[PDB]
Amino acid sequence: LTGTGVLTESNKKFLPFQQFGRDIADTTDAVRDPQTLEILDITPCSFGGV
Amino acid sequence: YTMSLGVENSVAYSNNSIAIPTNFTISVTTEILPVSMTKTSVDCTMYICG
Numbered sequence: 524l525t526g527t528g529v530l531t532e533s534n535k536k537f538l539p540f541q542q543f544g545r546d547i548a549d550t551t552d553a554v555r556d557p558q559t560l561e562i563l564d565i566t567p568c569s570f571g572g573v
Numbered sequence: 574y575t576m577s578l579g580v581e582n583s584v585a586y587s588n589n590s591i592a593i594p595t596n597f598t599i600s601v602t603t604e605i606l607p608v609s610m611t612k613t614s615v616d617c618t619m620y621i622c623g
């Protein structure tokens with residue numbers, strides 16, 4: 524699972540077999556780190572009109 | 574069922590009869606109107622190509 528974002532800690536409780544989180548419209552919202560099994564929240568890198 | 578349009582009513586008409594209200598009721602009707610959408614802009618290069 525490739526992407527680009529601000530990774531953070533999170534309070535989300537994935538089930539022990541689950542690896543990725545998705546929001547309502549397919550967009551990835553979290554991942555389990557595969558070495559230390561914490562759930563990282565994913566948020567996109569900041570962008571906007573100038 | 575075949576729907577009914579409402580109560581059928583022969584208005585009590587004749588060439589010399591008038592009906593006049595002896596009392597009234599103040600009514601407060603509520604009318605609701607949309608005025609504005611949520612404003613959106615899309616970076617179409619970021620949407621198409623990520």
Ligand SMILES: *[C@@H]1O[C@H](CO)[C@@H](O)[C@H](O)[C@H]1NC(C)=O
Nearest residue numbers: 539555556557558559560561
């Ligand atoms: C990977 O190795 C580290 C060594 O500190 C350990 O803490 C962790 O639990 C290990 N994870 C797996 C999936 O074996």
Ligand SMILES: *[C@@H]1O[C@H](CO)[C@@H](O)[C@H](O)[C@H]1NC(C)=O
Nearest residue numbers: 593594595596597598599600
């Ligand atoms: C007019 O209608 C209201 C509501 O039914 C009633 O309280 C009031 O007494 C009536 N007044 C007359 C003059 O009939």
